[PDB]
Enzyme design. Sequence first.
Site, short mmCIF file in Angstrom:
data_model
loop_
_atom_site.label_atom_id
_atom_site.label_comp_id
_atom_site.label_asym_id
_atom_site.label_seq_id
_atom_site.Cartn_x
_atom_site.Cartn_y
_atom_site.Cartn_z
N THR A 1 0.80 -1.21 0.00
CA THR A 1 0.00 0.00 0.00
C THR A 1 0.84 1.28 0.00
O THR A 1 1.48 1.61 1.00
CB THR A 1 -0.94 0.05 1.21
OG1 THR A 1 -1.40 1.38 1.38
CG2 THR A 1 -0.21 -0.37 2.50
N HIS B 1 0.19 -11.30 14.42
CA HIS B 1 1.18 -11.44 15.48
C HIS B 1 0.99 -12.79 16.14
O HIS B 1 1.15 -12.93 17.35
CB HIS B 1 1.03 -10.28 16.48
CG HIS B 1 2.30 -9.88 17.21
ND1 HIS B 1 3.32 -10.74 17.43
CD2 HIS B 1 2.67 -8.68 17.82
CE1 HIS B 1 4.30 -10.11 18.11
NE2 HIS B 1 3.90 -8.85 18.35
#
Lengths: 214, 214, 214
Positions: A146, A190
């Site tokens: 992005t 995570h």
Amino acid sequence: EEILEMHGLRRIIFDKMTKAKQIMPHFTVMEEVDVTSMVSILDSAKARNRKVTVTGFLARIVPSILKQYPYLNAIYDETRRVYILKKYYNIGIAVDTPDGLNVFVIKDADRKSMVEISAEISDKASRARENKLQLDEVQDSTFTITNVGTIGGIMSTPIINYPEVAILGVHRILEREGRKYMYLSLSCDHRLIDGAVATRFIVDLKKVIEDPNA
Amino acid sequence: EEILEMHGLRRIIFDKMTKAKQIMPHFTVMEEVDVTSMVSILDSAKARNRKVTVTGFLARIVPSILKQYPYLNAIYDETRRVYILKKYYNIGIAVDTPDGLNVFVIKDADRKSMVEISAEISDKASRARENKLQLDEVQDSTFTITNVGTIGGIMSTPIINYPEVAILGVHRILEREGRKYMYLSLSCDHRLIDGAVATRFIVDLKKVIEDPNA
Amino acid sequence: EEILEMHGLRRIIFDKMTKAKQIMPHFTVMEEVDVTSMVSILDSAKARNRKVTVTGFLARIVPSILKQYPYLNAIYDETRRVYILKKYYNIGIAVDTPDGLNVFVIKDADRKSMVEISAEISDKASRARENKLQLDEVQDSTFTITNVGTIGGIMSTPIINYPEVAILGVHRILEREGRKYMYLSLSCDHRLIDGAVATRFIVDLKKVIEDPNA
């Protein structure tokens, strides 16, 4: 006030999100890059053989390091406690189209030379704006990038495109002293990706924008 | 392309991290610090003494600032409603083992000299890479700190080790102009850690690193 | 070790935050701003005009730019299906109390002058830190701001005051060249506020602080 509802593409992008971080805990890490060694590399090739965009150069390098760090080029399944570590590399590119944010993919990026990947993003983005893009072209992003840098911004915490496992944020160029700088960021799940291993990734990548001569 | 199912250690983190930013809304702050005064107290007790690491250091200062900011060291329990603040400060620390990431607890950090703390980090870290750590040694952490500032990185939005109520993010020593600065980040549960009371703590800490002559 | 649970304010924020980053998924971008023109503009106006605050100045410009991105001045809803974009601009600016964090509204802010604004913000403030504040003054925030840069911290990932759909963190100002810069973080909902628009907003803010004159 005027209450306004939800759309198709808007209902999609609403949904992708409500889910993305409904179930992926987001960790985000950054470094900076002496992009001066980079910046000029496009300017010499923007001199002969237009183009290579900033988007375009990055997508050139990104795969060959996901090669070393496999945990980041992967997908998250609904068989629940599961994997999909994709060995082939089709990278996503987030672009702004008048209706809402659309992701598309570069067919086997680890094969394409600088220009091709950049001529393609050109091909698909203005086609993405005029909303005439095809089913196969928006699918199977093993990873995604992005860029906000063609608008502005120092550094963001981007939300990962589901169900990949990692996203990367390009930003505006700097000019510290007297070199050209830019912050890059990394967001990931995570759980399938540690703290350390996310960061260990960005430095190996950084090193190839640090040293395009490698 | 490959597959597989969720591993013993990796799965404990998997679950922990989902139940981390699943119960706890994250708020992170970043304050820049001048570590120049810090760096050379590292270089001076590197020679005439030994040890006292970038990590092993901060672990020495943090417990006293937590003595002033009581909301930052408490663990979040089963029952909603309840919080329980802890008066006994042992810090947990973030070491990357080959088997996945880990968190050991140098106990009562308030009663160990920067040396002990930085021996005890390495003592336990050396054994962490063989998961030959005792169940006892990886317990009771009221707070936690995490160093990518060994592997790289300037900034983070890290994930609080649950059930503790915050975390602190160590980073790389950037040299702006002619002195040394590294950015710090602190995330925490913004349910009990306010906008201010987070910044207030990392702003009080900013002092302690910015003059260890304290 | 001390139990202490939840009180009045503590409960209202706990509950308000649990639910904030529980529906609204949190994307946030940062931009650095040359506030030298702003900062000197304060001091010339302080030597004589009593006002204006770092906050109040920012606060005056804020509604101006929401009149250019319709999306950020909005508030989320009951049954999912709906979204209600607000047309009047009431900027909730959040300061500290003795019980915890509060938020209050500087109402129809696009009308009021920077002196007008900054007199009100400091008024409601010393009140709210005395918890001497009306149900009136805490009504319809269309948009929230959080200046912790009065405490410190170059930046944060501030969580949007529910159910308002954007927020803005104000920060510590640092000298580089030395010119005068700080960072400006805007968090928001990633269901509506696509990436580009968040940035397209805080470049459009960044440009107004830097040129208060045209």
